[PDB]
């Protein structure tokens, strides 16, 4: 109970938020509307698996977007699913939604689907060591300078937790011109919960 | 308060307005914690309910500046 | 007409000095040497650089400063004489500097940390 969440250190220095906003005269409404966006496309994320979700505002229109990892999973064939999700969202939005869907180039840059996939093999009965090692090896075969893991729970179908998961390369944590990424997931087969504190590093 | 309008609860007032010039009754079960007294209330005996068990009290003429709940506390102190 | 311009910044109070050749006075908020100030308007405090340059002088001062108490914005008086002698005499500047007279105090109110009472005053460690 001693570390500082690193994504809160680098925010407001080199990175930017999910908001090009000056929230005046309607604050909690857009707040717990963005939260409704989060709770409503939460069921849309099991197969589509976007990473970054950006919001902008037009004159009287809502201009948001999604950055997915897989192109055809939500754009469909001739715009079938996109218009349907616009219609589903417009009842929660109450304003003209106008979106765009961007395919990531070189699509293994994400740290979100890394956590989602390691939670997938952890919820599909794989032991703890070689899953983490094959995760860091397949990240190295793509190319990344450092990947750390601090796993806990009721590990490998047994009793009281550990704090393990091992690494590769040099990794600047305490520097500030670093651009490091972090994620925490919830993951469980049946024994309580086994979270994953994952880490990557790409190099400036 | 009282001089910028007496604070007496209206439907309990309507319970005691029904028997203004009538005989002094024995029991009126109520809650009796919010309404104060202005002197046209003399003579009654209204069951003051503390919160657990109601205890009645009769009414003289001297009661001019307080409520009914100032005599049945919430203590049971012994 | 002849007048001077000397600014001074101590204890969060800028002090523009409209120095004019006179006999040695002050119109601070257009008020004289004790129309604004109590008895703590001391000689070596205020009139220090007159003993090294323009001895004994002096010239009459016009100034408008607020910020600090009586002893705080009086500390801004020395910067006015410093910048005035900076304007006037280049050769006495070394006698000023070797006597100091220009080293601005970089001190403000100290940052007061949470978890404690004050900037440094920790709470009473009531152990037992």
């Amino acid at each position: 109970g001693q570390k500082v969440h690193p994504i809160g250190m680098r925010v407001g220095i080199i990175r930017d938020w999910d908001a090009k906003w000056y929230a005046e005269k309607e604050y909690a409404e857009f707040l717990h509307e963005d939260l409704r966006i989060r709770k409503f496309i939460a069921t849309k994320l099991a197969d589509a698996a976007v990473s970054t979700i950006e919001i902008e505002r037009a004159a009287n229109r809502v201009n948001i977007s999604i950055h997915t990892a897989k192109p055809g999973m939500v754009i469909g064939k001739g715009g079938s699913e996109v218009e349907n999700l616009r219609k589903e969202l417009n009842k929660l939005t109450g304003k003209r939604v106008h979106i765009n869907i961007v395919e990531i180039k070189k699509p293994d840059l994400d740290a979100k689907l890394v956590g989602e996939g390691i939670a997938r093999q952890l919820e599909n009965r794989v032991a703890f060591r070689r899953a983490q090692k094959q995760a860091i090896q397949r990240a190295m075969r793509a190319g990344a300078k450092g990947i750390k893991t601090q796993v806990s729970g009721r590990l490998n179908g047994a009793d009281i937790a550990r704090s393990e998961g091992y690494s590769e390369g040099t990794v600047p944590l305490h520097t500030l011109r670093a651009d490091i990424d972090y994620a925490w997931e919830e993951a469980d087969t049946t024994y309580g919960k086994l979270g994953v504190k994952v880490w990557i590093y790409r190099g400036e | 308060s009282l001089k910028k309008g007496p604070f007496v609860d209206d439907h309990l007032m309507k319970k005691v307005e029904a028997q203004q010039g009538a005989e002094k009754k024995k029991v009126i079960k109520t809650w009796s914690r919010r309404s104060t007294i202005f002197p046209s209330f003399v003579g009654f005996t209204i069951a003051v309910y503390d919160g657990r068990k109601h205890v009645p009290v009769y009414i003289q003429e001297d009661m001019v500046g307080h409520k009914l709940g100032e005599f049945a506390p919430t203590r049971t102190y012994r | 007409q002849v007048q001077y311009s000397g600014t001074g910044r101590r204890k969060n109070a800028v002090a523009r000095v409209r120095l004019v050749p006179g006999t040695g006075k002050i119109t601070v908020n257009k008020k004289d040497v004790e129309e604004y100030i109590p008895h703590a308007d001391l000689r070596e405090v205020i009139n220090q650089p007159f003993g090294v340059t323009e001895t004994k002088g002096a010239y009459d001062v016009i100034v408008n400063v607020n910020g600090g108490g009586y002893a705080g914005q009086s500390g801004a008086i020395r910067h006015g004489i410093a910048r005035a002698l900076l304007q006037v005499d280049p050769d006495f500047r070394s006698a000023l500097k070797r006597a100091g007279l220009l080293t601005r105090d970089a001190r403000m109110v100290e940052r007061k940390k949470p978890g404690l009472k004050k900037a440094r005053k920790a709470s009473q460690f009531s152990k037992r």
Binding site: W21, Y22, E56, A59 | - | -
Partner: protein, 99 residues
């Protein structure tokens, strides 16, 4: 001269780059621009503890910075008024217009 607008947002660089864009469009059709006035940037305070059940002393605070810009225009023309009534881009930054 009967034209003035305000520019208010969080940061500084997007505000004054958009201010230079609209100053460009203003003094293009005419002349006589005033200053892109920096406003002294009102600041907020918050004070939030770190833990849930105990440990009040572990503070972790947050604040807000809100830069503001005022723009006046001297000796206008109908063309700069048309530029300021049909162009409010960028949309990520909000402005406060008058005349």
């Amino acid at each position: 001269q009967k034209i003035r607008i305000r520019l208010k947002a969080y940061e500084h660089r997007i505000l004054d780059q958009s201010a230079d864009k609209i100053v460009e469009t203003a003094k293009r059709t005419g002349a006589d621009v005033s200053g892109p006035i920096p406003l002294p940037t009102e600041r907020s305070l918050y004070t939030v503890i770190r833990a849930t059940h105990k440990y009040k002393d572990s503070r972790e605070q947050f604040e807000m910075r809100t830069h503001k810009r005022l723009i006046d225009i001297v000796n206008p023309t109908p063309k700069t008024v048309d530029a300021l009534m049909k162009l409010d881009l960028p949309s990520g930054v909000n402005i406060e217009i008058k005349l």
